[PDB]
Structure 1
Amino acid sequence: SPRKARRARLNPLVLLLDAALTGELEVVQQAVKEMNDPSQPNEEGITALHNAICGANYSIVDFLITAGANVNSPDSHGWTPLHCAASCNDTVICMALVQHGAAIFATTLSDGATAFEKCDPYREGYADCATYLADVEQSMGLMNSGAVYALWDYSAEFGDELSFREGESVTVLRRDGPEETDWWWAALHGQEGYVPRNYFGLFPRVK
């Protein structure tokens, strides 16, 4: 059952997404080498990683992450790979994503929810997944000496805000600051300022 050249008139991205959804690893492997960007989305913002997650294809997910697939790419509705993993209550995938640069506080375009809030209480594994994500959220600015990793470059909009580049480590000084629920007082190279929570991961992206 090796991989083979597709029928000439079929769209390769479509075959990629189906293979990621059903579980055909070699096909995914072939597509990834041929395409320029393993994070290539269709018209709906859906990427191979999104489908691998929903299909519970652990082998394909690891391959894609290791290959550099954008673990934070949002679809047309603002759902990132972490949001999909949570809605399936798949703790193992959530962990793999978190450990490779997932933005814990990213929110969807629809209903503006975080991954934690997308856990499905109607499906099995709900308690375990929600608890993990809740612990992940609480450990930020506390664990690893209070350090979090920027997942994107950010240019301060105000002097009281902090500028930073993708991949840099930021220390969270004030987390539960009441005056700002979506920002944290932080430190980068001796400078102190506010930074948006959704720009950070517990771990850095795979470069």
Structure 2
Amino acid sequence: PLALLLDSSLEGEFDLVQRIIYEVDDPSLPNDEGITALHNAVCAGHTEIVKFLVQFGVNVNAADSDGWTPLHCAASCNNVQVCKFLVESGAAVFAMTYSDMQTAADKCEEMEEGYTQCSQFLYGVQEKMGIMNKGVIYALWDYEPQNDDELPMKEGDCMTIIHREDEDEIEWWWARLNDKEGYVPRNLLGLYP
């Protein structure tokens, strides 16, 4: 039962979470508001559960009603350690909320709260991604080109950004995938490192 996973995660019943996750080893937790088990864990701050679920293969980029993903939830909590873990495991750094349209980095510190400095980490990635890791990057989603100069992506592809920048598109990275090259939306990428 999904409700079991949601609340044990929220409540921090790690033994329980571990028991029922197999009794729907297809969690697919969404809840009527869009909050999943991974949202609850990140929110209540249960690193071990956060670790377990992600490790289990829970989608790191689940978005709720207002577009909040677990990274948005980690950053609002100024949790750099959880942020470093999620990114490490596939967080969509550029996923934005739908209303104020902001990224996780922008969510850091409710207001003065529990010392930000988390922002720097996230802001670092948004700025070093595609260039660090020797320009390597990974596709968190598939991508069907609209325009001819766009690289076709697929769930999880490794590629090297042949630089990016302002000149032509801020939202679009110029990458080399396999042996081909083209435009890729930075919104579906992650370091995946």
Asked if TM exceeds 0.5, the reply is yes
Conservation of the 8 A alpha-carbon contact between 2:131 and 2:163: no
Name the counterpart of 2:33: 44
Q: 2:112 aligns with which of 113, 122, 127?
A: 122
> C-alpha displacement at 1:142, in angstroms?
1.1
Q: 1:111 aligns with which of 83, 100, 106?
A: 100
Name the counterpart of 2:135: 146
C-alpha distance in structure 2 between counterparts of 1:62 and 1:177, whole Å: 36
SS at match of 2:161: strand
> C-alpha displacement at 1:100, in angstroms?
0.3
Identity fraction in percent = 53
Q: 2:150 aligns with which of 157, 161, 165?
A: 161
1:131 aligns with 2:141: no
Q: 2:83 aligns with which of 94, 110, 126?
A: 94
C-alpha distance in structure 2 between counterparts of 1:97 and 1:110, whole Å: 24
Q: How many residues align?
A: 192
C-alpha distance in structure 2 between counterparts of 1:39 and 1:148, whole Å: 26
Q: Could you list the runs of 4 or more consecutive aligned residues of structure 1 that deviate by over 4 angstroms after TM superposition?
A: none
Deviation string 1:60-85 (CA, Å, 9 cap, x unpaired) is 11110110000001112111111110
**What RMSD in Å do the two structures reach over aligned CA positions?**
1.3
C-alpha distance in structure 2 between counterparts of 1:37 and 1:112, whole Å: 30
C-alpha distance in structure 2 between counterparts of 1:96 and 1:105, whole Å: 16
C-alpha distance in structure 2 between counterparts of 1:157 and 1:191, whole Å: 17
Name the counterpart of 1:80: 69
Q: Which amino acid in 2 is paired with 1:198?
A: N
Q: TM-score, normalised by structure 1?
A: 0.88
Deviation string 1:16-36 (CA, Å, 9 cap, x unpaired) is 222111211011112211014
C-alpha distance in structure 2 between counterparts of 1:178 and 1:86, whole Å: 30
Q: Which amino acid in 2 is paired with 1:42?
A: N
Q: Which amino acid in 1 is paired with 2:164?
A: R
C-alpha distance in structure 1 between counterparts of 2:27 and 2:112, whole Å: 32
Structure 2: where are the runs of 5+ without partners? none
**1:31/1:125 CA distance change after superposition, 3 Å:** farther
Q: TM-score, normalised by structure 2?
A: 0.94
Name the counterpart of 2:16: 27
C-alpha distance in structure 1 between counterparts of 2:126 and 2:28, whole Å: 26
> C-alpha displacement at 1:13, in angstroms?
2.4
Larger radius of gyration: 1
C-alpha distance in structure 1 between counterparts of 2:152 and 2:104, whole Å: 26
SS at match of 2:48: helix
